[PDB]
TrEMBL record, chains A, B, C, D:
<feature type="binding site">
    <location>
        <position position="285"/>
    </location>
    <ligand>
        <name>XMP</name>
    </ligand>
</feature>
<feature type="binding site">
    <location>
        <position position="283"/>
    </location>
    <ligand>
        <name>XMP</name>
    </ligand>
</feature>
<feature type="binding site">
    <location>
        <position position="286"/>
    </location>
    <ligand>
        <name>IMP</name>
    </ligand>
</feature>
<feature type="binding site">
    <location>
        <position position="223"/>
    </location>
    <ligand>
        <name>XMP</name>
    </ligand>
</feature>
<feature type="binding site">
    <location>
        <position position="300"/>
    </location>
    <ligand>
        <name>XMP</name>
    </ligand>
</feature>
<feature type="binding site">
    <location>
        <position position="264"/>
    </location>
    <ligand>
        <name>XMP</name>
    </ligand>
</feature>
<feature type="binding site">
    <location>
        <position position="178"/>
    </location>
    <ligand>
        <name>NAD(+)</name>
    </ligand>
</feature>
<feature type="binding site">
    <location>
        <position position="303"/>
    </location>
    <ligand>
        <name>XMP</name>
    </ligand>
</feature>
<keyword id="KW-0547">Nucleotide-binding</keyword>
<feature type="binding site">
    <location>
        <position position="221"/>
    </location>
    <ligand>
        <name>XMP</name>
    </ligand>
</feature>
<feature type="binding site">
    <location>
        <position position="262"/>
    </location>
    <ligand>
        <name>XMP</name>
    </ligand>
</feature>
<feature type="binding site">
    <location>
        <position position="216"/>
    </location>
    <ligand>
        <name>NAD(+)</name>
    </ligand>
</feature>
<feature type="binding site">
    <location>
        <position position="304"/>
    </location>
    <ligand>
        <name>IMP</name>
    </ligand>
</feature>
<keyword id="KW-0560">Oxidoreductase</keyword>
<feature type="binding site">
    <location>
        <position position="55"/>
    </location>
    <ligand>
        <name>XMP</name>
    </ligand>
</feature>
<feature type="binding site">
    <location>
        <position position="225"/>
    </location>
    <ligand>
        <name>XMP</name>
    </ligand>
</feature>
<dbReference type="InterPro" id="IPR005990">
    <property type="entry name" value="IMP_DH"/>
</dbReference>
Amino acid sequence: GSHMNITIGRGKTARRAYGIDEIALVPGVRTLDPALADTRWKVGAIEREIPIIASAMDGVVDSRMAVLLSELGALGVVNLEGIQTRYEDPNPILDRIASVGKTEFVGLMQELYAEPIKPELITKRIQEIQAAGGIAAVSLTPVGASKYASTVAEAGADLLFIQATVVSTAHLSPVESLDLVKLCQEMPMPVVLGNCVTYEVSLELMRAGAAAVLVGIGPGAACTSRGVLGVGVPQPTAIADCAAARDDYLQETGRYVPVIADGGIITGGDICKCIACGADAVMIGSPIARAAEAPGRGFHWGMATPSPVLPRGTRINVGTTGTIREILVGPAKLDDGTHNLLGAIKTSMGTLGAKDMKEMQQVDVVIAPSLLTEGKVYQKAQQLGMGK
Amino acid sequence: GSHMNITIGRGKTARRAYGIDEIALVPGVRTLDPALADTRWKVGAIEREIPIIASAMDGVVDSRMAVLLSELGALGVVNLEGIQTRYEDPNPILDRIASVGKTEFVGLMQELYAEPIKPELITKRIQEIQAAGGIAAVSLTPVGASKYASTVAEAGADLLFIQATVVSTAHLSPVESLDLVKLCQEMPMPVVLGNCVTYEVSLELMRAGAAAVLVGIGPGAACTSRGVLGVGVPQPTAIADCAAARDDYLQETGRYVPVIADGGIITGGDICKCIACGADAVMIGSPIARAAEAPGRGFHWGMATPSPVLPRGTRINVGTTGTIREILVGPAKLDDGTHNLLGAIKTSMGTLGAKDMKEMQQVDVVIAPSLLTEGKVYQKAQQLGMGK
Amino acid sequence: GSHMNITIGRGKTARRAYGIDEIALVPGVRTLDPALADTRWKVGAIEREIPIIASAMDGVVDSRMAVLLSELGALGVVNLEGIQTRYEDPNPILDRIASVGKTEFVGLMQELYAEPIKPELITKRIQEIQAAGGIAAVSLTPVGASKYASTVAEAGADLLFIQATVVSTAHLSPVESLDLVKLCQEMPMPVVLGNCVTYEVSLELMRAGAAAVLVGIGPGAACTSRGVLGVGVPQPTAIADCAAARDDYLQETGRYVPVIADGGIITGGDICKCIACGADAVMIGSPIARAAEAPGRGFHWGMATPSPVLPRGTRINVGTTGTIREILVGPAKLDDGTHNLLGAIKTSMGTLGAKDMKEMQQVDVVIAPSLLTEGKVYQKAQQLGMGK
Amino acid sequence: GSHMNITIGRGKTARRAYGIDEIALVPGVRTLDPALADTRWKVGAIEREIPIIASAMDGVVDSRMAVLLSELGALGVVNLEGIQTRYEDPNPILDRIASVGKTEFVGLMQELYAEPIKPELITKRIQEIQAAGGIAAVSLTPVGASKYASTVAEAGADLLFIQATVVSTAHLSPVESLDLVKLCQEMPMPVVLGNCVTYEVSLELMRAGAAAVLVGIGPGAACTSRGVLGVGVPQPTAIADCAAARDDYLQETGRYVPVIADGGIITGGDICKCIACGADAVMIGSPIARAAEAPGRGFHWGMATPSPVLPRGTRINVGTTGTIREILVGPAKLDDGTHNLLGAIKTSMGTLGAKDMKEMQQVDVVIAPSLLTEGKVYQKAQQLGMGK
Ligand SMILES: O=c1[nH]c(=O)c2[nH+]cn([C@@H]3O[C@H](COP(=O)(O)O)[C@@H](O)[C@H]3O)c2[nH]1
Ligand SMILES: O=c1[nH]c(=O)c2[nH+]cn([C@@H]3O[C@H](COP(=O)(O)O)[C@@H](O)[C@H]3O)c2[nH]1
Ligand SMILES: O=c1[nH]c(=O)c2[nH+]cn([C@@H]3O[C@H](COP(=O)(O)O)[C@@H](O)[C@H]3O)c2[nH]1
Ligand SMILES: O=c1[nH]c(=O)c2[nH+]cn([C@@H]3O[C@H](COP(=O)(O)O)[C@@H](O)[C@H]3O)c2[nH]1
């Protein structure tokens, strides 16, 4: 049920939800120098200068990437159910994924990801990241946590991400469902929970003890769950609803639970739109898969692509456009806002007069589908700038 | 008339109708394991585990396909006014339809479908399906029913579908119009009636004795009636209006008349959206014409294409992507949700917390045109996943 | 001003107008056999079985086409300011226009159309059409009428069309403006006036003595006025507003002034949508330029293309798909509703239960942008049916 | 905050903003001869017959273009932070920009635009334009004005444009922010200020002493700021809001500050739409870069493309379609409304009955996305007229 009830037909209503591509940000009463724009966020006791997290996807984050992201002031999450924990040396496996043709990568991944997880590799990945001075953030599905959460705790990871395509505090197992309250209470580190798109679920995740909530179902560049299942709420609406839960939970308890907008982001402008709708940080995959150091070798695939029965992701060719440093902090060599993402955030905040991220969440927004079309006929035809 | 009156101009109003591509499904309060999702539906006394019916189209269903579908838990309808009853061996005819060029198939079909129906073949198709252990479901137009309904009864078909592009209980013949009340009373088997898109007509079809109602005018992949006639209501709105008639008819009489969303479905997500708007089952053609066993040999054409005066269908090349087994129950080798349709339904129901089809009809819906665009720039450009 | 005031910005409002491609027709309470559908309309004392008028465009109507259309039960208008009155032999000129390349036709037409009008040819075209048994309908611009209206009267044309891109009863000349009241009173034949898109103007044209009003600014397939000037109201809204003026004028005076929806029509479905919004007949150009007998030799150009200072039309390649008989009354060999237009109207009226054109004007309409997209992915990709 | 609050999600609202491509103009009560349409505007004491200003962009305006535009009754602005002030002979530089490939121009421009500004060239450009009989209009960014405003005054420029992507009267420097009140008071010539898109900012710019306000953030054909930053309000809404500020400032003080719609204009129709929403004149770049005399050699690039850290523009290929005379006053050789822009304005005003620009600002507007799609299937497919 909802307080908004557009009529689909007799006895069936809906509410309008707006996508990243439908909104735009409006200047306020003042501008400010981009150098003054404060972009920090915080999860648990970990402060970060860059409000960006690399998705737990095998084309995006390996141990080296996690360290490079940590040194730049950002974060990267290693997926503990991917190739990194199933193979001692993932590089030959990543080589095969990148070289196979378009009609074959699904069947290949279904085979390669069938190799059983080695619990010892969970520990090693955590420890080799930390030994190199990086923040060790790792992800598990709810089922994975029931099996490997204690391994993560004993290894001493800095952050645990429990991430399912759609998560709730209430799950009807066929089997004991994962008790998220117990998990957050028992794990020695902060626990991030996702994904959701509704006020109701995000609030319950916060009440369960979440250190942050991941918002987004299916917006990702390599994700097909929306086509396979028909499930999803566009990001601006999802982010705003979950930010409202954050603010109500803060009022109730005094505890601040950051909201992370997860997926569907290509440009710095996409990031800024997500912050304006309430996000404290963003989780992105495809923009970082384009880094020279990315394990995907120019490819980027969803972690549900290898499902043996029902793939819900695909493998796309994103290419390689620069170093992870250039992508995050520049200098930008490109015209499309996919490099120097931090500089884009600070520049946008400057034009809008937002001194820090909380002020950025307060900027006025317009519904403006023409933002991406007005005057862009040449760019679209010639695949330049906003038309690439 | 309608209770909603958007203004087109002075003295002309309209109501907004929403298409499959305009909506999305929102998670509820709980998730559940897909293995617990009950996907059954029932028409007459026939229960089916898969809520899918193959359209009565010559590229989709022949006798073998009808048996294969029944064995898997679904249904297939043989069109008794197509080539199956006009030719003892349809295979050479299907060969010609598939081999001729784009500028020639209309004229060819106008000729081939002029071969008179052989009443003995009506009996033969029904009985050869049943002798092989399949459920024999057959379709006729209203005019066809006035001539051949008794032949279908004498042959002992399990289900009769009366299907016109647009049907009503009230028809002004130039001829005696088909009395649908008498037909349903006199036929010894359940009679499905369609097609319609309004509460008013669907309710009258139920009062006439329909075992089910087919909803949809022109959404089909090989249909051109919307361009030829300008008639149609997008599916979510039509389904909801007709589901409302079902619920009112149930309150009035205690009899449940399932609503079948007919046409325009490509992916598992499209199916789930139709159920969420009130459908008890779906009738699909093009997704099954892509089966290796489909008689269309990779082509799919509307059964109004052969009209000698005004074709209202076309012949499209849908290709061959897998076996009918793979398409309906998997395992899925593809990234786009066109295989393992049953698995997609159960997985979607799982993410939404819908234990059975009735609960699925209650899931919250958003108007979200961005569901199909957010983040999908690569998929569209490379024709992968949702961009194919 | 208007009673609908959507906000563009502070102090600037607007009203929503809907295009042909945004609406669809909804079945009513009954269906009827297409053979019973009465499609007649009437202008002056001239009854026509086919409610279609061929546009006064040099690629569409010459003397032969005007006769062929009259014989089939329709009408064709000869433009008295085009090639037909500037050259004794238009065929070599039409050959050149159709034979020159895309980058050259503007300059060529600017040259060719500078040849002065020969008033004697006005008489000749009218008289040769009538001598062949055809209805002689001719068009002039308002300025043209001030110079040649008496020639048309002396020649004895059956119908006079006064047509400007945008006409009003009130025009500020630099020159004596055309007195439309006097024109209609003095002309011995019915005078059709256009074009307009508003209730206010159409009502004044009616009060001035119009036998019919032409509705439409810029929807045409070979028209660019909307891009050059930014002026226009989409057809459904324009038709409905002008139909309301017709109904009010009828109440005031008892005189019925038919509303003609002019331009932007490709298929029979487009015609039916225009009738449903209030049109008594349609004026179409591009569908008839596709006739084997069309003077355009497969090309179709706007009559403002030859402007020596500011072209407001272009030349498109529409091809040649059949005889004018096939296009209007079939039998249709095509799958896209561009042939057997009369059969399409009658079939559509049948599905909607409309016994005559007045009933067709009462059919329910939905705002349904998805009408043209639902399920049409294959047709669009393969350029078949609705995707051509 | 705003008086319109569409809901994005709980606790986040927005207002609908409409783009140029979403609106259309409606005829009024009368038409008038285009020769009677008064298109004049005025800034300071400078009256101009053509309400068009060439953008301060290096592909659009050099000294020759500025003179040619002035002679025709328009204006051209020289960007004093581009190559015209960094190189004594810009031609070899313009040659290089036009010769490099798509993947190379960003890096090249970052290098070429790093050449320091030569203050003596500021004087030279201004005075050589005036010596040739042209009106010398020049642009600076706010930071540039703090350094070179006195140089412009000493040189005796006719108009000074202070232009930033987003400007406000309130700017938080890291440094003394530019005092716009002092600037306008101390400069001996009129000072135009921009850019903005809100009533609040434009009103303050007027109160600071602006001779005109530039409206627009990111609509330009060679701009990517909307993608890089996510900031922008579509032009019709921005123009109307800022025109409302003009009218209130006029009521307050009796001083008229013209509103200039800046960017995103391709055709005469786009111009007319902007005037109808309140603009007193338009600033355009890409349509004038297509002139034979344009310094871009057929290319057109944003002046933020050369940013060494975060480019916010791109280089597009606009080609060369005619002389600047043909583009502005015709005769038009093209079918798409990109030539004879003045004739298009007067013709549009004629169809609408607008005797002067103030009446044009009062024309009725419809929200009509179908203006650019209705009937245009051929034009789009064949890239003719409105489909190029
Ligand atoms: O439906 C899905 N199937 C998948 O296979 C999949 N893999 C990743 N994700 C989610 O997408 C996010 C990455 O989005 P981008 O690539 O656009 O950053 C990630 O951060 C996840 O939230 C998936 N969603
Ligand atoms: O207007 C029409 N003209 C035709 O020739 C035609 N043939 C099939 N159908 C209908 O389309 C449904 C199949 O749609 P899909 O191929 O999208 O499943 C089918 O189940 C039918 O409802 C037609 N509709
Ligand atoms: O703006 C315009 N510039 C032109 O050059 C032009 N030529 C024809 N017309 C109008 O278009 C109608 C024909 O439209 P179709 O080809 O789509 O039928 C015709 O019936 C006219 O109303 C023009 N409109
Ligand atoms: O965001 C931006 N980055 C740039 O690099 C840039 N360069 C020009 N402009 C603005 O665009 C206007 C020209 O627009 P058109 O080429 O569409 O006329 C100009 O008049 C400016 O207002 C820019 N905006």
